[PDB]
Swiss-Prot record:
Upper lineage: Eukaryota, Viridiplantae, Streptophyta, Embryophyta, Tracheophyta
Placement of sequence motif DDXXD motif: 289-293
Positions that bind Mg(2+) 3: D432, D433, T436, E440
UniProt gene name: EAS3
The reaction(s) this protein catalyses: (2E,6E)-farnesyl diphosphate = (+)-5-epi-aristolochene + diphosphate; (2Z,6E)-farnesyl diphosphate = (+)-2-epi-prezizaene + diphosphate; (2Z,6E)-farnesyl diphosphate = (-)-alpha-cedrene + diphosphate; (2Z,6E)-farnesyl diphosphate = (-)-beta-curcumene + diphosphate
Main location: cytoplasm
Other comments on record: PubMed:1438319 indicates the presence of at least two genes coding for the same protein.
One annotated Gene Ontology cellular component of this protein: cytoplasm
Name of this chain's protein: 5-epi-aristolochene synthase
Length: 536
């Protein structure tokens, strides 16, 4: 039986992550100072008689520095006060920042705050073109729109064109901040990634920087980084002992990239257990994907799909040897999850992730049938299958497993495909389809997203990609609306879904395709987050 020729690049990391020995003295020193710095910072936040602009800038700085997870209650109370006092009497810079921070935190501040900055036609007053800080904050704000915010329709184009015009003559690090922003907006970036850039490239170089905050941010980042490196070591050893890199040589060797994904979903220490579970799932489902995509025959894949549905070690014998490997490994991983949640009494929730995995595999098999048949479905039918194959319903569900406060009701809500989840899935699907169209088209994938779209509507490749881009923009608005209070579950269970969408934007930036080819996009991020500490 002829199998395809292996074509994936080797892991580019080797063993450099396999063993990390934390320096307890250094760790405890950092933790001791951070405690002091944390309290100094709390008092900055709780200071009375601050002007609105000063308060917003403080909160914004603490958020960009990556240390706001220490001050969730404090920041919430303050933004809530600002929301309810409803003061509209400020300049563009403060107004746009006020708008972004409140919306990002679920406070539905009216977009009417921007009317004084527009003419009678809703277009921004062109006389604001010389106010760089206003334009920058408007630019960042333009990305948190919902469908109810069409008044802000012009904001992105307006701020973009004038920021571009001004940038070459700005002083540093404002110039670098603007240039970075135009390439990657804050709201749609991976939080650790934006934080690393902000601390090192911007705040560290600000003449006006607060030294207490800067020191706080650097220590905290480097301290959390020690934990992440410990996690990645523990995970790298797990993967090594599985040894798929030799027994399943057709499959991608990408556990580091998978860790980066999981780190993107949450970075905080309290989610350590959750992160480790999540990265194992992503690794394992990546193996299954490649089995369907680049090795298994139709008959093999059918048996594999059936065995998954039945979910029973008895079924291994129905499978070819090489499939027995991943199949047992899958069953065992979930038995590990169950035991790992036993003492917390949360073992019962693992079945939710299993049912989503079954769904992914069913749709993988459908996808294989389509390819073999040369079937090009209508867009609606394509999406009915291809949304699950992003794995994003599955990953979002998995993200909940290690979260100590995730309840059965939280899983029940997720299981109904709520709109914020569907939007995140849609974003992953259409961006991936736009990025990977050309190569899949060369591999004879008659049923790619863009292809289905072209045939269905009778439009060009260009027109199809534009339509897919609109679907992504619509979905972001839905995600943003999905964060507005009151929320159907705790915000803590929405942020993972938002972060999954950010993962997409970052991974396929400039329409590149980055997990399969981590050299392009992900390698600098991995080095910055998991290899190089921030120099103090
Ligand atoms: O759905 S496809 O277009 O064929 C390719 C999807 O982007 C695959 N999503 C990844 C699967 C491997 C683990 C990380 C997620
Ligand atoms: Ca695939
Ligand atoms: Ca793809």
């Amino acid at each position: 039986i002829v199998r395809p020729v292996a074509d994936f690049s080797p892991s580019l990391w080797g063993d450099q992550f396999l063993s990390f020995s934390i320096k307890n003295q250094v760790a405890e020193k950092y933790a001791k100072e951070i405690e002091a710095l944390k309290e100094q910072t709390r008092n900055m936040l709780l200071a009375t008689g601050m002007k609105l602009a000063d308060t917003l800038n403080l909160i914004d700085t603490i958020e960009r520095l990556g240390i706001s997870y220490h001050f969730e209650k404090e920041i919430d109370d303050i933004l809530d006060q600002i929301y309810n006092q409803n003061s509209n009497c400020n300049d563009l810079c403060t107004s746009a920042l006020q708008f972004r921070l409140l919306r990002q935190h679920g406070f539905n501040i009216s977009p009417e705050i921007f009317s004084k900055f527009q003419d009678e036609n809703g277009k921004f007053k062109e006389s604001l073109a010389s106010d760089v800080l206003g334009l920058l904050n408007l630019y960042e704000a333009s990305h948190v729109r919902t469908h109810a915010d069409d008044i802000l329709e012009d904001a992105l184009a307006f701020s973009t064109i004038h920021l571009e015009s001004a940038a070459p003559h700005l002083k540093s690090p404002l110039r670098e901040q603007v240039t970075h922003a135009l390439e990657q907006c804050l709201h749609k970036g991976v939080p650790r990634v934006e934080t690393r850039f902000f601390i090192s490239s911007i705040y560290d170089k600000e003449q006006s920087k607060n030294n207490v905050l800067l020191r706080f941010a650097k220590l905290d980042f480097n301290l959390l980084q020690m934990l992440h490196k410990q996690e990645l070591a523990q995970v790298s050893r797990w993967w090594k002992d599985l040894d798929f890199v030799t027994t399943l040589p057709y499959a991608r060797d990408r556990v580091v990239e998978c860790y980066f994904w999981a780190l993107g979903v949450y970075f905080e220490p309290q989610y350590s257990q959750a992160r480790v579970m999540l990265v194992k799932t992503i690794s394992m489902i990546s193996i299954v994907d490649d089995t369907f995509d680049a090795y298994g025959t139709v008959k093999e894949l059918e048996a594999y799909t059936d065995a998954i549905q039945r979910w029973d070690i008895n079924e291994i014998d129905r499978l070819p040897d090489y499939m027995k490997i991943s199949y047992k490994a899958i069953l065992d991983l979930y038995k590990d999850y169950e035991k790992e949640l036993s003492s917390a009494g949360r073992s019962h929730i693992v079945c939710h992730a299993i049912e989503r995995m079954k769904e992914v595999v069913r749709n993988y098999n459908v996808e294989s049938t389509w390819f073999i048949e040369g079937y090009t479905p209508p867009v609606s039918e394509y999406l009915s299958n291809a949304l699950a194959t992003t794995t994003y319903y599955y990953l979002a569900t998995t993200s909940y497993l290690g979260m100590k406060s995730a309840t059965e009701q939280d899983f029940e809500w997720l299981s109904k495909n709520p709109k914020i989840l569907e939007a995140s899935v849609i974003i992953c699907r259409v961006i991936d389809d736009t990025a990977t169209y050309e190569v899949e088209k060369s591999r004879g994938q008659i049923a790619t997203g863009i292809e289905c779209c072209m045939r269905d509507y009778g439009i060009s490749t260009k027109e199809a990609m534009a339509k897919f881009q609109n679907m992504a923009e619509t979905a972001w608005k839905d995600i943003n609306e999905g964060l507005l209070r009151p929320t159907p579950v705790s915000t803590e269970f929405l942020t993972p879904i938002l972060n999954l969408a950010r993962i997409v934007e970052v991974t396929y930036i400039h329409n590149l395709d980055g997990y399969t080819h981590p050299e392009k996009v992900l390698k600098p991020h991995i080095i910055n987050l998991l290899v190089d500490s921030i120099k103090i």
